[PDB]
Amino acid sequence: GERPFSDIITSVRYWVIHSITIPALFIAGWLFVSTGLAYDVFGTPRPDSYYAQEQRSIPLVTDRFEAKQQVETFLEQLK
Amino acid sequence: MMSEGGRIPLWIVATVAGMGVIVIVGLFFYGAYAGLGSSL
Amino acid sequence: ERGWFDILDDWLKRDRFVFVGWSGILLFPCAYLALGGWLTGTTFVTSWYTHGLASSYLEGCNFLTVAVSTPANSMGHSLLLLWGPEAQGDFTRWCQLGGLWTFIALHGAFGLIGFMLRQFEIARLVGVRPYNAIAFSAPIAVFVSVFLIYPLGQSSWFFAPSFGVAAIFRFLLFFQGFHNWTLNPFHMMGVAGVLGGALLCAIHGATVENTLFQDGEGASTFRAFNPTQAEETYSMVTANRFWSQIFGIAFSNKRWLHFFMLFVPVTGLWMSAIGVVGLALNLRSYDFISQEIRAAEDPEFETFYTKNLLLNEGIRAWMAPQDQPHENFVFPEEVLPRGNAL
Amino acid sequence: ARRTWLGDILRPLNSEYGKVAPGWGTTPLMAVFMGLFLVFLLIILEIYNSTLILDGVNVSWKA
Amino acid sequence: METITYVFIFACIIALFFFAIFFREPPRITK
Amino acid sequence: EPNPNRQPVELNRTSLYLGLLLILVLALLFSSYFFN
Amino acid sequence: GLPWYRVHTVLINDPGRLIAAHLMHTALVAGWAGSMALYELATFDPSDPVLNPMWRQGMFVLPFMARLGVTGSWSGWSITGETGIDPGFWSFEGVALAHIVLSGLLFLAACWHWVYWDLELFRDPRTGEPALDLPKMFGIHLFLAGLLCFGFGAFHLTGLFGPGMWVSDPYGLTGSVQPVAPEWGPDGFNPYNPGGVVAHHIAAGIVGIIAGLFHILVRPPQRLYKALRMGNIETVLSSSIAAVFFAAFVVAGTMWYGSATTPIELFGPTRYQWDSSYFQQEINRRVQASLASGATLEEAWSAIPEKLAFYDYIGNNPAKGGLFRTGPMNKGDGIAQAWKGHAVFRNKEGEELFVRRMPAFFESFPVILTDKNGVVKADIPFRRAESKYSFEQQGVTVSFYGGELNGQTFTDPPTVKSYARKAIFGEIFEFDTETLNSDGIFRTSPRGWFTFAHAVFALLFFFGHIWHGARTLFRDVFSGIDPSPEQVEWGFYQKVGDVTT
Amino acid sequence: MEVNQLGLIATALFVLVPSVFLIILYVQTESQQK
Amino acid sequence: MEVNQLGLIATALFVLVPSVFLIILYVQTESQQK
Amino acid sequence: PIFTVRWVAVHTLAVPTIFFLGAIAAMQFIQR
Amino acid sequence: TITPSLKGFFIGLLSGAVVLGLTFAVLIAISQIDKVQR
Amino acid sequence: PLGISGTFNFMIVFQAEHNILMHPFHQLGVAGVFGGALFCAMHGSLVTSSLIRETTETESANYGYKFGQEEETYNIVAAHGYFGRLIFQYASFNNSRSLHFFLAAWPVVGVWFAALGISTMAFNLNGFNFNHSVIDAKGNVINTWADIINRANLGMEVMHERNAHNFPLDLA
């Protein structure tokens, strides 16, 4: 019932739309990482946030129900 | 801007798209050797 | 005059490019969330707080090393729902705790249910017998036993496979070292069915392609076939004679041939699932008792079986401290099993 | 076919093969019971799982 | 006893191969 | 008077050979574990 | 003719012979239960519920008899260790005999139904064709099921007319069959609360009676009758198999995790009790409380019941077995005889050291001793040339408190090391390894075997559900597809499989 | 080798019982009016 | 009782081998044209 | 506007894909 | 008492009901607009 | 070795010595044999799904095909109609020759690559090595799943042929 992708993607209308939305989405994803927002949304350490300066033991979660607080505490221990 | 198919030949779309892929994947490989993940 | 249910039914079952169906109501969201959860976690999400591991492109991993990792052992078999008592609605904390693991496992399970319902729904609509759905029971048995039953028998989800290339390879090696899984006859039947299935796939496709009738003038022979033709496109009689003379036996019945193609790999996967259900309980084929009694009494008696357990013992001692961080293992240099020099 | 004393007594219980209520009948009510059943199963699972923790419900051998 | 058992089973399998090949149900074109 | 639900049963020669192959190969696989 | 895998299909349209096959199945199952119990009674040693309970002996049916109140033998003993009891008829032997007799009556009933298959009851009065009114059968059976469920909860489990059920303290030390009152608050849904089992049966039973009455009195909607093919008995097979694989998964789960219906004196301890050091904690609690009340170390440990120490031992953990290591747990480590007492390890300085215990995952495990802060103080080296922590270098000794070896101290390093190897397994026992020619290799308990068989069967029963569901929903195409090319090809129909579009 | 003393009976019956089931079925198929 | 360990398998096959011989012959007789 | 099932399907996949590829591209320039 | 995890449970249930309710309302609405003539 | 446990010995030592799991040709091998098995089951179920009715309920459908008959025994159009809707139309084969070619090519190519994996690891060009590839701002190694693989491989390495090595490197 609908048009073949090969018609749609060889049309000017398609390229006019997508020459703008493709770069736009690409640049939004670039900035998501380049501004560091990706770190904070997901809670992923930056290269300087795996360990506090002197320690070498990993912040493993050890308590099911205050795992949330344990992580909060580990995060404060990075000064 | 017509919806008519065939105006931008399929062979050129496929060439340009494929070149785009080679570029993005090549950048990924370059990153295997620089910055994070590079072992250095 | 027509009821809303019938009107919804019509719309669900319209012939469109992507068939939807009632099954689609379950399949599409769950399959989308499982796949999207995997892409998201492997791109952005760490395993530092659950495993002490980097596991995302963002941290520097590559396609082979990224994973969505299982939660910490301390989480037990918690559903780890976003709104649950561990994460308590906090999306960031949820990711750090391993909530994307159960997200992906559970949505992936409901999505597999939807896909098999889809196989049924389409078969009923088009009017074919639903063997394809029946064949899909094997992937389902493998998924459920490995991703759900297995960790449910163990201490926690931590010991389920993590979703990633290298993480899965780690899972293989864990099963060798701790379960001696290669010794298990249920695994061996699984092996036979997968390798047997790949054998049949290859040999059948090659036999058809080399007993084709000449139905065109082209040297490239694909054009000389029509979907609607009444006639078989290759000779069953010549193929039967060839294999009878080469291998001693041959198929003569096309329906049996195709049923057997379903049977072999489907049965193999089902048998492997059974063994993994045993491993959930540590009910391994780890040892042969007669071997161990003889070897204990006779220090000159050696087999490939005893040689493999020495490798397993190496694997457990060398991998366990980093692989099971919640145990806090410290194995002094002097206690590590090692052969000479190495 | 063989009639028997007990068979005669039981006859009415096997006499309405194929009989239906028109259209959807009590399907809507059934749906509601099914939904409540699903919610009950979710509750007992989450209690066993310690995803739902209730006052005075210590899910342990020990109280 | 175990060795006998394994060799017995193996021997039966080879015997089966012989019957399956030389005493098969012969393929016949319904003709 | 006879039960009209009765039916003949069959096992053709190829199925005998397939079956005996299954049984003997499963015995060849499992016997080691039985002896242990 | 019929292929071998379809021979039983001859029953589909023959209600009387289907009943005969069901009767024969039932005779076989009941014969199994009677046979199994007699074999267990012929092999069971009732003389030590402390260190040789049923779950150490490979008993599978005996705990199910005990769970519901059969605790006594005609020969005078009870499973709690009593002498001089009169269990009446319902001893373990009476239960076995009753199942054997049932089996025989069922068998005779099967024969009768097989021969006299052509009952007028099995025919549709109107059409004279064999007919079963499945929707109404469902109401009748559900109602009977409800009555029996209700009665089971309200009379048997309460003790109101019946013996009650097995209950125990949280450490499985003092188990016995007791009347249990229903629990009607939210703790009724706690799996470890036995009053919830009682309230379940009362409440779910009343609900089965009500719904069975419904299903007796109200016909299925035409829409559901058609969609679920309620004239096709194979529809019932399909959904019944689903219900059963659901139940089978549930019982595997509560067997593995533990519940009030899977008590540890009947099935053995769970693997999670080892994982969480559940018994070690309670042992250390008691010992600490004795020391605080003024006990010597000897007295504190001597007050620990042998049965409590024995739970805190890995050879009783059901996650330490093997699929082909067959038989009773006693066949591996041996028949437990006596607690040796609690081993305390100390180095030359007199500091107390603790042997790192084996996690269930490991078939073998090194010997490593740490101080109370987790710092490694001694071990048994593999390579010796660079050993720093040897028992010999560190002057490790062991002293026992409580049990056989109370008050003894060993200093000979091979001896101290042998006890340290035992300590990785938890508390240390003396075993008889001769009586059964025990081979020293751990086996699982009935807890482990039950879980395994039921998880496996549940999974296989998923296939059976899918298979019979398909056969029900595609009955028309079971022999193949129609000998309309426009219904499978694209473009022709607006809505798939509908020619009216 | 100190093998399990029931391994021989288990293997023999494992082989014999299903094989005999198939032989019974095959021979009574052959003897049917062809 | 210290019985001969081969007693069981000797007894089992003594029963099974000729019983199955007879069953095979009986069933294919029944399946012959009425 | 008139959307189709196919169009929705296409964009649920395509749109995040591009966004993610932009993210991953940027990550190739992170130094520790 | 309504513990934190029981409130969490209710949040989970409402969430699921909303997702399902919205999904079905949307699908019913669409099917009623966009109908198969016969 | 020519034996079942000896084969497993070979595989484990090979992992220790070549990290074959991390080698893309062994990865292609796996794709070939898992894919072979998937497509075997797929094709079998599709053809079986669409057999033309030629038999009664009490007979095996296999009796609906006679050795050497001219007509196809199943409806490939119907098979295609199902599979094309299962995925989308063009994901499905309706040229049986293209189909059977694919069935041949997929496992055969994959398994060629498996063979070439072993045959090139034979000259010690080994699996990918990301051991300590991820390092933090200070220089601390942040382990990945590769490093956990490496700890299992070490165990195999140090234990194999426990009496055979006198010098520190296993160089063959």
Ligand code: CLA
């Ligand atoms: C068919 C579609 C579908 C299905 C089957 C699932 C299933 C699941 N989801 Mg996913 N989800 C979906 C679509 C789906 N989701 C969509 C479209 C989104 C984006 C909006 C999500 C986003 C999402 C998140 C963020 C999470 C889940 C999670 C879950 C899991 C727990 C869900 C739960 O407890 O619901 C409980 C709710 C119900 C069972 C609905 C009950 C409906 C009943 C029958 C009616 C009751 C209504 C009642 C009268 C009103 C409420 C009472 C009041 C007191 C509030 C389960 C695997 C969780 C998980 O994976 O954690 C690991 C999780 O964190 N989902």
Ligand code: CLA
């Ligand atoms: C006050 C009234 C009352 C009370 C106190 C109880 C108390 C109980 N009921 Mg009963 N019940 C009642 C009324 C009551 N019930 C009524 C009116 C009905 C309707 C007839 C029921 C129907 C019912 C069912 C159907 C079940 C209970 C169960 C229980 C127990 C829950 C604790 C447990 O061990 O769950 C353990 C069970 C669960 C936590 C449910 C697991 C649900 C699974 C996960 C669904 C998915 C299954 C799928 C096949 C899994 C495949 C994937 C997997 C392999 C990974 C407990 C004895 C459960 C029980 O029997 O436990 C032994 C149970 O299954 N009840």
Ligand code: CLA
């Ligand atoms: C639910 C089923 C069940 C369970 C959980 C148990 C549990 C137990 N029994 Mg009981 N038993 C059962 C049913 C069960 N039994 C039945 C039906 C019988 C009659 C045969 C017995 C007769 C029996 C005796 C005579 C004895 C026990 C004993 C035991 C204990 C040791 C069990 C053991 O060693 O297993 C070992 C289990 C295995 C080695 C697993 C076998 C796996 C099979 C062989 C796999 C076959 C695969 C298949 C062929 C593949 C086909 C592939 C094809 C489809 C392609 C344990 C408490 C022992 C005990 O200690 O008693 C006091 C004991 O002496 N049992």
Ligand code: CLA
């Ligand atoms: C209550 C459960 C139940 C019942 C009543 C049935 C009944 C039926 N099945 Mg279904 N089925 C089930 C569960 C069940 N099945 C399960 C769990 C599975 C997956 C394993 C299947 C998979 C299945 C398939 C694939 C097929 C059937 C077929 C049939 C029909 C013919 C059966 C026959 O002649 O076998 C005759 C069987 C033999 C002569 C020998 C079987 C020997 C087995 C493999 C090993 C021995 C088992 C042992 C003796 C018993 C212990 C059982 C216990 C542990 C549970 C019949 C209506 C067939 C069909 O649809 O016909 C039209 C068919 O093709 N079944």
Ligand code: CLA
């Ligand atoms: C792969 C999974 C699978 C598949 C493909 C089928 C397929 C089939 N089923 Mg079976 N079934 C299943 C599993 C499955 N079933 C399970 C697990 C159960 C529970 C024991 C059943 C119970 C069952 C019955 C009782 C019947 C069927 C029937 C059928 C047939 C008709 C379609 C149907 O009713 O679907 C049923 C629909 C589903 C399986 C989809 C369920 C989706 C749920 C509601 C999502 C729940 C989300 C959850 C609340 C999220 C929270 C998660 C929590 C862990 C946090 C068909 C053969 C019928 C039949 O045979 O007709 C002839 C029939 O009577 N099914």
Ligand SMILES: CC1=C(/C=C/C(C)=C/C=C/C(C)=C/C=C/C=C(C)/C=C/C=C(C)/C=C/C2=C(C)CCCC2(C)C)C(C)(C)CCC1
């Ligand atoms: C189409 C297509 C596609 C794509 C493709 C592509 C993307 C391609 C590309 C291509 C390309 C892109 C090409 C290029 C080429 C080039 C060339 C070939 C060049 C040459 C040059 C030279 C030779 C030079 C030389 C020199 C010297 C030597 C010195 C100095 C000077 C000079 C520089 C001159 C695909 C597959 C998707 C699909 C199908 C179709």
Ligand SMILES: CC1=C(/C=C/C(C)=C/C=C/C(C)=C/C=C/C=C(C)/C=C/C=C(C)/C=C/C2=C(C)CCCC2(C)C)C(C)(C)CCC1
């Ligand atoms: C989780 C979650 C969610 C969801 C999400 C999602 C849904 C997402 C999606 C996402 C996505 C959807 C993404 C995508 C991505 C993609 C990518 C990243 C791609 C890449 C690719 C590439 C790179 C390519 C490659 C290749 C291949 C594959 C083969 C051929 C060759 C080449 C090389 C080209 C929600 C919110 C509900 C909630 C919470 C959680």
Ligand SMILES: CC1=C(/C=C/C(C)=C/C=C/C(C)=C/C=C/C=C(C)/C=C/C=C(C)/C=C/C2=C(C)CCCC2(C)C)C(C)(C)CCC1
């Ligand atoms: C007639 C009569 C009588 C008698 C009765 C009797 C004496 C009975 C007995 C009965 C019995 C005495 C029975 C038994 C049964 C058994 C069974 C039925 C078994 C089965 C088994 C099975 C099925 C198994 C399987 C298996 C195996 C073998 C291996 C492993 C795996 C499984 C578990 C699967 C009287 C005088 C009372 C009166 C009336 C008449």
Ligand SMILES: CCCCCCCS[C@@H]1O[C@H](CO)[C@@H](O)[C@H](O)[C@H]1O
């Ligand atoms: C999507 C949930 C499935 C539940 C099926 C219920 C459809 S029942 C509903 O009932 C009305 C009154 O009887 C009818 O008029 C109407 O046509 C029908 O759609």
Ligand SMILES: [Ca+2]
């Ligand atoms: Ca001995």
Ligand SMILES: [Cl-]
């Ligand atoms: Cl070696």
Ligand SMILES: [Cl-]
């Ligand atoms: Cl050397």
Ligand SMILES: [Fe+2]
């Ligand atoms: Fe084919």
Ligand SMILES: [Mg+2]
């Ligand atoms: Mg980089």
